[PDB]
Amino acid sequence: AHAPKVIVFISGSCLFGAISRSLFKKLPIPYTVVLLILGAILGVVASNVPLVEEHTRDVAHMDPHVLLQIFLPVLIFESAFAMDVHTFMRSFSQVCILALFGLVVASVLTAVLAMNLFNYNWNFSEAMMFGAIMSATDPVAVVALLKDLGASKQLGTIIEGESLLNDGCAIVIFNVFMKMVFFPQLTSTVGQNVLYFLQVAVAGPLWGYAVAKVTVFFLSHIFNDALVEITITLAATYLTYYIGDIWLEVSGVLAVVVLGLIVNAEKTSISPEVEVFLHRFWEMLAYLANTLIFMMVGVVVTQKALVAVDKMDWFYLIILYLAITIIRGMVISLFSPILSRIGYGLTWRNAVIMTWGGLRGAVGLALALVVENLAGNDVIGSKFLFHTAGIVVLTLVINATTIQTLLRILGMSDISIPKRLAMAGAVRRIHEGQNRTLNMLKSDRFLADADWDIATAACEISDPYSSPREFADMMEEARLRMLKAEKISYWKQFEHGMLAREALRLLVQHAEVAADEKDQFILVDDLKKSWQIKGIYPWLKRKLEDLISHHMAFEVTINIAIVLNIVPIIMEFVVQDKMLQKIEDALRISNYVFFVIYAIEAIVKILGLGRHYIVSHWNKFDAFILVVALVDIIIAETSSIKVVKLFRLLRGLRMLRLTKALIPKLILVVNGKINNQLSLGYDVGKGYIIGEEEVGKIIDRMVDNKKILRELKHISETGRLQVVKELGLLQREHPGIAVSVKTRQAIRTILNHSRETIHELQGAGLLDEMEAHKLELTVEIKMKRLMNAPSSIPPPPPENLLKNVSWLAGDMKLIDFIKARASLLHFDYGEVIVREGDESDGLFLIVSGLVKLYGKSVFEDYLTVGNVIGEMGVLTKKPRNATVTCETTVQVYFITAEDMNIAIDTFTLYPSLEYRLWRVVAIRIATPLIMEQMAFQGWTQEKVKLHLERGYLVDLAESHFQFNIDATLEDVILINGTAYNAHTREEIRSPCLISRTVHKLTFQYTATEEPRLFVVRN
Amino acid sequence: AHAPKVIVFISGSCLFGAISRSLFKKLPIPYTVVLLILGAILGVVASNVPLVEEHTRDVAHMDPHVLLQIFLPVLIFESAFAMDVHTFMRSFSQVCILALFGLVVASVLTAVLAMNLFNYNWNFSEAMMFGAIMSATDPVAVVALLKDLGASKQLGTIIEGESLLNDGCAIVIFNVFMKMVFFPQLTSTVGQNVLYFLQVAVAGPLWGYAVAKVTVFFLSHIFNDALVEITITLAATYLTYYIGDIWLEVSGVLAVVVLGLIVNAEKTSISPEVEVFLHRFWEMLAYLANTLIFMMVGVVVTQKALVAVDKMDWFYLIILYLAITIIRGMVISLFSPILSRIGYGLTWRNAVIMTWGGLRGAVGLALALVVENLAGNDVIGSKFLFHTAGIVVLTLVINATTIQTLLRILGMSDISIPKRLAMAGAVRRIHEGQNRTLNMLKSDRFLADADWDIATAACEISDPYSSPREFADMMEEARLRMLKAEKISYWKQFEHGMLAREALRLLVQHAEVAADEKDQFILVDDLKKSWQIKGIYPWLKRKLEDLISHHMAFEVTINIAIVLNIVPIIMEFVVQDKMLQKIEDALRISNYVFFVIYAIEAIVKILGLGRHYIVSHWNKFDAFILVVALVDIIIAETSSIKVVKLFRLLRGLRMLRLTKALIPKLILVVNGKINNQLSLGYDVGKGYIIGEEEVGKIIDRMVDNKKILRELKHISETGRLQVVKELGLLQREHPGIAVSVKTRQAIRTILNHSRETIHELQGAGLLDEMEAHKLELTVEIKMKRLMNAPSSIPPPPPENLLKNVSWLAGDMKLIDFIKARASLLHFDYGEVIVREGDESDGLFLIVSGLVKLYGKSVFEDYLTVGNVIGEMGVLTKKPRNATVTCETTVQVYFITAEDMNIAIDTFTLYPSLEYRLWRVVAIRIATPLIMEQMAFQGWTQEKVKLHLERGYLVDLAESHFQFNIDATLEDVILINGTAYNAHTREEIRSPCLISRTVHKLTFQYTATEEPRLFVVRN
């Protein structure tokens, strides 16, 4: 059979690709040129040696179908799949203008040249096929350099996206003109041509979109089956192309492009193992396709093409190379007035790279082989193949090698001083670690006599990269140094999962954009562009909710019944539109019986709802459709004008009333869009707030100048406050979406720490490897089920807020008491709930709204639902520390200090209510104190809070003296009250970090300021 | 074209497999039965609806070639690839006996039944095809249960290996009898039949072995190219099959089996990413093959088979099911007298599982489809397909579901108390961690109002599994508790890379075997089976080294010349054996010119070496071959008997002398085999020593009974000492191999810690993600280059040992001094180098041999090259602490205390020589002290040593008082000398762990016992 033999030839191609790719890794020329050389050699061998000709001929040629329907889909999908979708969408308008118009203009100009330069006397359709071939690109070799050098990352994204769209549209143009040349048909009317344009250009992406959304839907519902996900992705990728191109005659390649982009975007719905597998799998297929195409080009160019090449063809080829380079540069320059004003903009030297980086590749060669096959004996196939191969070789030899020197000359290969210094520091760190390990290993019993001259050489890692004027100098130093601290903070937040990858990239992009620009800091108005939702979706949401504003089984039954009955309707009316004696009778009978049994909705609803049945708007349509069907059924017991109008009405009216059930789902879709935008804005805002709170502890130990310190601290806080206000406003604008976004991240954090506990048990050897996977898989299934959480969650009632406060969360009997003794208060904008210095009246738990707080230790921040205000008012029993003002309509539970005192004095079990309240206060006191001692040591706020979570209040009043052992402790904070050192007799009367040299403490009955102390176990 | 359509059908199969696999996950029946049902439905549809018949018929049938040459290789290779090779090799004799003989006996018995039960009147060849089909297996559904239950892991390995070999040999038997039935040929002679048997049974595995070794060779030389590795593996896998089955007519399937097993074994030569990709890729292909085969079976069984099935065929099918189950059980029982005495043995209930677990699968169905296609219109194809499908369905419905209940009834589904308790503890740990994180999250500003009723329910992980008599009870408790501590230690050593995976599995197997057996502890003689090298390779090594015992370019030129000239020789003599006028003349001329130019070896060597040229043995053959060629060339200037003998001699003599160059490489091969065995033994011994040294610190805090304590401590040390002796002996037996094995692990440890430093910088955000990958890739390329390190490394000279001692390793001027003042001593067995209580004479650095040490703090251990003996003899200047005796011929550098005192008093820079010596002493003192405080806390010895590596000696004598701050320190050990507490005035005169409550220390001029103190920075 032929299939084993083609697999054999594919494996031969595999090994030749391996050889070429391995040996010429040193040399600058890419391996594809070596594959062309090998193809040429194999061609001459198979020509002069018939013993191998008769074997190889059977596989040496490829039908147009295998090219256009296997190779091109693979290449185009792999290109669409490896792309970073988000930056592409960020630059879509620029990349799409450049691709879709530059392709047309470049192909037209190339076709004009091919008619006027070459003596081949081609007509315009042939020249346009030629231009479409010569306009394809393959910059995989250049985007790699732009990624490695790191400079102008947006340029790499733009070039790659342009290549993707350019290749897709080039294939479409080729498919048109190939038909006009090799499969001519009679002149179609303008209307049919317009429909054909819409079929290829508009139906394609829409078909891809539909299949992509269906595929991601199903992928979101598969668990513990990597094979099913992989298989579904592959089957969808091929069926999209085949059904599009063959059955629908819709542009398959564009649908495949859209499918790749969408599936890449929705990567969160795919388990990570399947993600990495799919990336490597499509890379492998693209590699095989490239090797096969290049070797086939060499073989057939020696066998069939070069036998008909004249001395003038080489001159034409050189002129063509110059012409296409000039055309591409001219196109880019001509659109520069537009591209400069959209997306990323376009620097001159970026335009130079984009011109020079236009490598041609496998797509053009595959199209040239299609032409060569279809042309048969005509010279046009040989001319096409020769010129395409010549251009490919010239670009891969000249451009693909000189691109590096061009990057150097234009001044872009220079790696920035920041990154160079970071690399040098990291290398020295690694080197010191190696030195330590070398010493230990030398000081060991078993490996004492290893040849260290070999080992030390073997491990050596080496560097890969090798007064007011003074006040402005120091200011620019501090500016860049602070932005570096912000970058570090954003990465640290990412690694623990406080940040989504997209939020991280947004923040890092804003930080590097702020670094290169003069006198700049991260602009809060550039962050606001995230959570400021575009009004389209809110508009739609309120509209649909307005539009949607008797047992449960009835509507389920009727909604099923519509789907059931539409099949008879369409079956009959399509037949009547197209044009068994029992079948038409059976269809009419089915219509009549359906109309009869529709009493179970019509009259049942009329009687159940009573006279007011018609008040509900949709029941009016329910009556109307029955009225129409009654007449058009009664007619049967009594012409063209009857039937051709009934076939309109009895279809149209029956499908319409399904929208009543459809709207609730579109509401969910709008909610999902709003949820995604709100979640991204929330993540970036929270990340920025935390980054400012962390960098605002580092700067006090990192700039000396006590004027630059104040200016940077002011810029930091004036940025922070706007965000903390706006995030509070977002909740009020869209409550339930925010509630869902909060619950989701809560679960995510819990699951991450559960995985870390599992890995700790695994590394400690307390849990088997096979048991570790079994637990981890449940962790992952829960994590994936997070993606299917409702996009909106109903906000909890206030009693559920009381039920969940950290200190209330315990005894049901205490919760019942607090229900029995509480009051609910409501306040308007600008009402001030708390003043400084007033005596304690009770505790406030805010259940709605946003409040601003102010007071000297200043403290200008805000609080929101679930926060408790006046925490120690009944513990310390002293004048208020701060003022609280309503920034919004605010609702709180107020429980009087008289109400507290009873429970305070009565709930005295070992998990004491006073103990719980003081611990809630102590964590808040302790966190800044721990940070001020460790922010430069590298911990984040959340690890600080988890570290303090293990701690407990010191059980004083057993006796008023204590000293501790570090074998049972690791940190101490004095929260409140008066204490004094047992050795030095120095008093401590402040919230203080108890330094680790403080040996022994003693206390006394300063009854107004009684002590509390907090300690952490190892 | 046909290829796009077959891809479409494959994608349809993909989606049906996805549906069946997803929906029936709850139900017990496997999805393949659902695929058969779907195939049946599709068959009846395509039968009664010609509109889809005309479309589907083109793909519905499959040629025998696509089955036998695509599907079967894929299935067999995937089976061979997923297998754990090492346990399979450990049980190979048992599994191979059972597979290769049970297959023959079962197929013969089934064929006899098929002749005698069925009225089909088959001949013996047809019945043997039938038996070969019915003897195939597919236990993938049962080995999964045996892996999940964890009981009888060896049984899972045995069943899986039996299936692999059984399927391979069944395909071979089928290929024989299919030829005899459907492609008959004339009766061959017995000799040709014997050659055919050798061609199928012996040449197959050898061809697979050759391709496997070549493939792993090339894979060992590829770096930073995952695609090349993947591509080469796939190309090799298919070319092995194709070249074997088609060009060589050698059994392809067996070669594929051997290739899969070998490539799986050599996984260390493949980058891990390529490993996981290949596993998932072959799983995917096997899944596709299974789905396609089952659906095709359903389609064709409805279209062609069931139309010719009678009421008696069902009775035959049921009788056949019973018969094959009985036959398999009988075979297993009959071989039980043999299988019980080899490999794993065979428990009765294991035999019951193996009988009931014999699921049939895709291989039998594919062979049945081959028969059905070849039979054409004959009833035999329908009978074969019907019976095969019936057996498959019966086994998948009955056996595949009842296997779980059988495992329960026989008493194997019960999970052991140890694992249940471990799971309960791990679950409670995870639950407590979730509780902590829940509390913190509640005590947070941003997520305060998340619906915790949703979150807490969402994250909940749940348990998956739900007096002398008293002295013996306590003894069995301590025995099992110690073995559990050993298991933990072996896992902890693995996670940091002190152990190879195989060494870990050896130790864990020995630990669990020792746990289930009564009154048992890990037997040192079971560890010895690792490093006790079988004598074959040492024998070969010495033999080849004996056999192998004038400018450099000459031999390179001649070794190339032999390879060059053999091509003319073979080209001429094959032609003369087979039977251009210029070509034969040119060949003779080439022979004569080669003989003439061979003067450049013959006479050049004779003159260069002189008269004694003939003394070297190989020069005698060099002269002999020239003598023979001279006569047979001179003949041309003067018949059959001439030519047919010259064609023997002038070939044979020319190839022989290449063995002189070949032997040096075979020496390397033998060295590699010895290296692998020695390395595995070394790893297991070192792991056992460290495990005993760690568990020997835990037991003092883990058993109360001070008699069971002594007995277990004695069993531990008496095991340890034998290993520490034998590992010392191994070095002397095979020096350079041991040196290479030491250097390799040194580099491995350094690279692991370098990777950890990189990940630390990455997590701290100090290094970019893209920079982190760039460094990590260099780390990985170095790690992979470790695999190509020489298998033997020449032992360093003594001056290189002096050059590398931890304290000598510094100033070149000090090294020069030590060269200037040193002495080298040699000692025999039983000479005692050091006695207790003698005055200091100097320091010993051992450069060769093994010495035993003894002394009260007892200390009964050994030391080896690179160890220094008498470390503080010139520091403390007091009577010796211990006795040292030569266990072997021993050589040491002895440098007199008089020689020390000068350098001690002169090398006083900041990196003081005395400082370095005291630090070398201090680490040795400090390590046990840190372990005794932390062994139960979970640290290993190596993390202890790395922790101490950061520490330094306290710079006393600035003033004799000090106190420290934990913000600059983390641990303290007092090494030697006299100190006293500043507050309590208590003296300290012992090597002591300075507990963290010790605030302040003071010292004094007790000149005989001056103090040294060691502290660790954070």
Numbering used by the authors:
A (entry chain A), B (entry chain B): 72 to 537, 571 to 653, 676 to 705, 725 to 783, 794 to 1012, 1031 to 1191
Task: Give the published text.
One example is the sperm-specific SLC9C1 that belongs to the SLC9 superfamily of cation/proton antiporters, known as Na+/H+ exchangers (NHEs), which are essential for the regulation of intracellular pH, sodium homeostasis and cell volume. The transport domain (TD) is accompanied by a voltage-sensing domain (VSD) and a cyclic-nucleotide binding domain (CNBD), which are regulatory units usually found in voltage-gated cyclic-nucleotide-modulated ion channels, also referred to as CNBD ion channels. In a recent patch-clamp fluorimetry study, the functional integrity of the domains was confirmed for SLC9C1 from the sea urchin Strongylocentrotus purpuratus, termed SpSLC9C1, identifying it as a Na+/H+ exchanger that is activated strictly by hyperpolarization and modulated by cyclic nucleotides (cNMPs). Specifically, SpSLC9C1 adapted to mediate cellular alkalization in sperm only in response to chemoattractant-induced hyperpolarization.
To investigate the impact of ligand binding on the conformation of SpSLC9C1, we solved the structures of the protein in the presence of cGMP and cAMP. In all cases, we could identify prominent densities within the CNBD corresponding to bound nucleotides, which were not present in the apo cryo-EM maps. Overall, the best-resolved cGMP- and cAMP-bound dimer structures, at 3.2 Å and 3.3 Å, respectively, share a similar conformation to the apo structure. However, we could identify key differences. Although image processing of the cGMP dataset revealed only one dominant conformation, the cAMP-bound dataset displayed a high degree of conformational heterogeneity throughout data analysis, and, in particular, the CTD was generally less resolved and mobile. In most of the three-dimensional (3D) classes and as observed in the 3D variability analysis, the dimer interaction between the β-CTDs is disrupted in the presence of cAMP, which causes the CTD to swing away from the symmetry axis. The observed flexibility in the CTD is also accompanied by a higher mobility of the VSDs, although at no point does the VSD approach the transport domain. Further, the extracellular tip of TM1 rotates around P75 towards the symmetry axis, pushing the TD protomers apart. Minor conformational differences between the three structures are β4 and β5 of the β-CNBD positioning closer to the bound nucleotides and a slight movement of helix C towards the β-CNBD in the cAMP-bound structure. Here, binding of cAMP causes the disruption of the dimer interface in the CTD, conferring it a higher mobility (state 4).
